[PDB]
Write a protein that binds this ligand. Sequence first.
Ligand code: HEM
Ligand code: HEM
Ligand SMILES: C/C=C(C)/C=C/C=C/[C@H](OC)[C@@H](C)[C@@H](OC)[C@@H](C)CCc1oc2c(O)c(OC)cc(OC)c2c(=O)c1C
Ligand SMILES: C/C=C(C)/C=C\C=C\[C@H](OC)[C@@H](C)[C@@H](OC)[C@@H](C)CCc1oc2c(O)c(OC)cc(OC)c2c(=O)c1C
Lengths: 534, 54, 402, 401
Amino acid sequence: MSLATVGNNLDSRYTMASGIRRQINKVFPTHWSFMLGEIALYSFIVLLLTGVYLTLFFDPSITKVIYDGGYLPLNGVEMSRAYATALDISFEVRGGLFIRQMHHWAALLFVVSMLVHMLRIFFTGAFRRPREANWIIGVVLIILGMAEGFMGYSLPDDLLSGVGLRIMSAIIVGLPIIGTWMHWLIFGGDFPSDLMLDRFYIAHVLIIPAILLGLIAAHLALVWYQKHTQFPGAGRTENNVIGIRIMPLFAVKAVAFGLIVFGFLALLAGVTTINAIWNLGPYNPSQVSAGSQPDVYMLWTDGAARVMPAWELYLGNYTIPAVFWVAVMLGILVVLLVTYPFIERKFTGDDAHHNLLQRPRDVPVRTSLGVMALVFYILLTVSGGNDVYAMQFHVSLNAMTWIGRIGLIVGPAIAYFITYRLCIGLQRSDREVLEHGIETGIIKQMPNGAFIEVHQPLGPVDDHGHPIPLPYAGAAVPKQMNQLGYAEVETRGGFFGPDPEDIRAKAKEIEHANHIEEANTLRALNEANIERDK
Amino acid sequence: VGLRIMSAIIVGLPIIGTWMHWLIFGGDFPSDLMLDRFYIAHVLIIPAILLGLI
Amino acid sequence: KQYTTQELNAMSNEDLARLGTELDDVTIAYRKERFPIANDPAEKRAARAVTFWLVLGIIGGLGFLATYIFWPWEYKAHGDEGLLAYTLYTPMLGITSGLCILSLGFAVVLYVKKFIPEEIAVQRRHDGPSEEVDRRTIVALLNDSWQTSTLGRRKLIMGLAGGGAVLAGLTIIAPMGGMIKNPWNPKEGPMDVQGDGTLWTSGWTLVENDVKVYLGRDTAAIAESHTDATGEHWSTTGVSRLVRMRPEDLAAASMETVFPLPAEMVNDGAEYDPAKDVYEHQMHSVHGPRNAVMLIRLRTADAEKVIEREGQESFHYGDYYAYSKICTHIGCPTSLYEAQTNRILCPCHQSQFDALHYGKPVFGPAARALPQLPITVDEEGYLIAAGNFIEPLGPAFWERKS
Amino acid sequence: QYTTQELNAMSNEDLARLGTELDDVTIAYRKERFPIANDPAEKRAARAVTFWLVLGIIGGLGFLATYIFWPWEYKAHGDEGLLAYTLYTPMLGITSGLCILSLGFAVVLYVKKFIPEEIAVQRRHDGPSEEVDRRTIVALLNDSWQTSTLGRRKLIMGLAGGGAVLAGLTIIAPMGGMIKNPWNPKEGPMDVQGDGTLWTSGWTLVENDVKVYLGRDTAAIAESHTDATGEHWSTTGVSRLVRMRPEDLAAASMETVFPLPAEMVNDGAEYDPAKDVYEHQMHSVHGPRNAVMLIRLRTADAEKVIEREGQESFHYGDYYAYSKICTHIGCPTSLYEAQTNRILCPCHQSQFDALHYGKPVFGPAARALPQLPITVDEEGYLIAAGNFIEPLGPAFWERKS
Ligand code: HEM
Ligand code: HEM
Ligand SMILES: C/C=C(C)/C=C/C=C/[C@H](OC)[C@@H](C)[C@@H](OC)[C@@H](C)CCc1oc2c(O)c(OC)cc(OC)c2c(=O)c1C
Ligand SMILES: C/C=C(C)/C=C\C=C\[C@H](OC)[C@@H](C)[C@@H](OC)[C@@H](C)CCc1oc2c(O)c(OC)cc(OC)c2c(=O)c1C
């Protein structure tokens, strides 16, 4: 094919060869947990495309109609146009239920992938300088994704979702001094109203997606510009990046992992029901169900409302309802999440330019704060679905409320203690290996009857035979012998027979040479880095 | 009246005029989904192509 | 340094590649081929692994398109023919599509993991502060622009310009006051069966307009599909959504949800008209935000030990009590009447109201007792609302007393 | 390269010149506006900018005052304060202009009168890249492709193409759920809009042995009844359509009629004020191919009519009925010229002769307007004796003729 002509025309018109050489040569570090952001990206793209598909069949109106659609067990029932067209998406469009469920599963995947990505960022310390901006905008992103899913599942106007909207409305009126006016502004009146579903619909399909995409764009541009962090290791410095290039390796790997994500969501979308609005019926202010609960990424808010005591102030002609402190709690924990880098810099005094990461064992205060916050959020999430838990595990409901209350103090504290001590223990295990060598597992008996375990040193030795203790380097230390390659197979062939011995000998020689030279280049780069530090 | 005229243009096309019409409008004109598809085209899809191209 | 065309010609293609990467401060520390042996059996062994998933990518894609076109997708109810075929349409769609896309992804991952070479590449960072000449010079240019302008000298033009800037900003955003709405200005027109559209009222306020308001039970009726030579028509002309109910109806320890049913919208009893279209208005009443009322009948043993609230004595009629079904926490239905304990439980956040202690919350995040409706019976023995609530219904808000 | 010691011995002018030069720019000429020490022209220009800023303050405060305190709610023709209502939006934009345009003119005048006059020259770096960049990027892409070895294995590459295109078809096959056959019935029993296909209208009901009157439109609106429990709009005794009789129309007149089945009538001797026929009659009015125009001709013009083959007995005396939908692209042909007997389409000016079975005489229409067969019934009302003999509306590929 005559690609020469295409490239020549493009280059003569844009002067693009150097700028594109710079991007195909860019390097990315290839640890596995640097793919957790990617999942959030791919599920977001799925959400976009499946979302536009749903908008071709959906009417977001609160006007009422008598149903005459496919699903016969609701024909003749008065319902909003929103609920009616969600039923038509589910039953009268070919493959519509498939795309609906794919959309909802993509939403769940988007939010949880943002969560575990943020936890990687937290536990490894990738937030600290020069990278705090990505932290602030990422906290904004997780909050807006949560709001987006809420508004999204509020659209089909079923009973459960409308109870959610009722609860939102009740919380907004309760605010002093301005809750009533805020409610009348947001909802255009009393709840339900004409323009509530139209406003949630245009918030869901246009406004919040636009902000989400713009901030994802800024986020990925900053990640591309400030090159990625990396763990310590052989050759790795603050001033470099070791990994693979965009072209060919990393781009292909990104496309393939994206295909995997798309296919997994497609599969979920077929083999498991989600939401199932046709069992719930249309929304009615006078009805309710026992398994209420919002979506999973909102259960923490629900749990916060369940564990709160009924603390109200009467002032006396004015009232502070008991849920106001739940809003205060949510505000506190949002502010503390978004401002954590500055808290850590206040109380550590660290303010250097960091491009290397920290193994979570080596920063135990942060890991313990992390696990305690994980436990506070877990108990809020289980407090949300605590009545389903009670029903399904033979626990008293009230017992679960008090479990939630007390747990939100004693769980985080026990978690802090246990996490901290386990962190120091893992540090000590690594220091054992760097002090005395790998415990091979072999026990010999000496002539005097002494059972001694055979150690493999990772460094020099004194004339007694004892290793010279190496300094810790922030990297992973091998703990067993098979990590050094002493279990590696040395036959070669298919499952049902070997290769010819000529090829096997040649291949093993070649593989040995490969390993020797890879070790040599990392050792030379290590020495060069020492020399650069003089 | 303008939507009526556009619909009548689209049915007249050979061969695929009738099928194109039933795709765009989701049925005979005026249709239950007509204004909603025009809405999301007007507020989301075409403004996004326009902003990306600008 | 630069290169003449003759020197770039003298190079080999790998040498040009090395120069290309080093121009970006990248260096390939290590790089080695996957199959150096000439006709390795392992390379053919790897090719068959990749082609396996590509074969199934093709199989799954074709199976998806077959399933999507020819599998009977249309709705079937329980007991219909071909029910099973319908229940599996979406499942088959997803398992075939997952087969296709996951197999393509796995093919590509395997191809990377055992055909493309392996490499260590090392890129030098350029971050931190800039190179000081650029910092000094950009500061010089920006300072030059500000002092060049001469606007710092002119405090009056600066003050007025800022004032006009902020005032133009206000002029831009002021039309957002088209959303602001006084929550205390009533709804348009007269009062409705949903109230005046403020947080004080409900449908039960209509008693104050001298309207007779029955307690009405929901019949849950649906529209009926009449059919004739001019088509098929779902209609509601002789159908009552709400019907009056009588004190004999509920056994002891029963609970009924009742709504305000003004006497103008009734259509039941011997005075029933088979063409009196009232379904629309009764539906408007069932969907009032704070119209639902919980009407309980206590047992005599329970009513012997029921505690009354100040001013709400004689709201009950015999053993019949009536509370607002709207939770006093943040507004869910308080639907769960534990018949034996006589405790009304809210399934949202697990508040518990004592039906024998004027509905006072005894557990959960609720703090106020459920409002109580005064009820009685009329000259024909239908239950009616003898008055309006004496409290604001629903959750709490800043402007509420107690 | 600029060591710090050299860079320190530099003015702000030196550093600014260095900066522009480092960016391949050179300020060829830049001169101050007011070099004199006490130039009155400076005070003059300052007064000019101050004027528009002060007027911007007046305009913006006027806007907020108007948007708050000017009375803005709708007033009808008879009301007091119709003037104050009609001037609201006018005043809003008058003051919005007076704010934002005044701020704009202020900034324009400041940049014209006070900021120095500048000429700068920048060199371009366009056209082909340098040859080393082109050669090196080609080397890197050749290296990537040949070292990948994917060109050596045609089966794997072909199956990768096959699987990728089939994955694409997997992705976009849901758009086939957006497809609908244009020739399915709608699909319940046929109603007053036909079976939803292009072959049918309400008048098709005649072929099902339904009596379908020609109903004239009354334009009756809902009535508001209010009382001690609210206010509500009602259409219970209201009828959008009523039957009509041959004595109603004068000798050169045109009425728009719709198909009114006998089960929707509710007028005349059989009128019940509780029969609620409104929504079905509106359904008849809002069918796309339902509108017909019933024309009574003068006698001397009626005896000049040239009928169409097969449609000689469709009229009833001087009463002719033609489909109101244009045979071009579907507008209503609602302009009956009473003297010329042309029926005119307002969209693209097609003219049909009514004394020549609706045949076009001008414009882009090519087909004659369909004619409805009509008659009178035993009670003396006008009915449709049959359905149209042709498809109606604009043409499509599948329509014969
Ligand atoms: C421009 C992008 C988007 C569009 C056009 C869109 C469109 C829609 C529409 C129209 C519905 C209506 C209900 C239905 O048809 O089932 C819906 C449901 C939903 N959306 Fe979105 N959406 C978008 C982005 C998102 C995002 C980013 C999320 C999550 C962060 C999300 C989460 C949801 C959820 C959870 C539902 C409920 C699914 C269900 O009803 O079963 N959407 N979406
Ligand atoms: C939809 C939301 C998000 C998307 C699509 C996204 C995407 C990405 C991607 C692809 C990367 C590089 C690969 C990786 O490190 O996994 C990345 C890195 C990063 N993310 Fe996000 N992310 C999102 C949300 C967040 C959140 C919630 C946080 C933290 C509060 C965050 C903070 C960061 C930081 C600091 C980095 C840089 C990592 C480093 O330089 O080592 N991002 N993000
Ligand atoms: C989703 C939409 C799709 C895929 C559209 C595809 C394009 C189709 C056509 O090209 C094939 C397009 C070029 C164009 O047709 C010439 C149409 C827009 C029709 C424009 C159009 O409007 C009118 C209109 O609005 C009026 O209002 C009162 C009045 C009109 O006359 C009196 C017209 C008119 O006479 C035309 C041609
Ligand atoms: C920046 C955000 C923007 C622009 C837009 C939207 C904002 C959304 C808010 O979150 C951010 C919103 C979710 C939140 O506001 C306090 C409220 C609904 C309260 C959360 C909430 O919900 C529930 C719910 O939904 C239920 O459903 C069945 C059930 C529930 O208990 C059983 C609850 C519940 O007990 C709580 C506290």
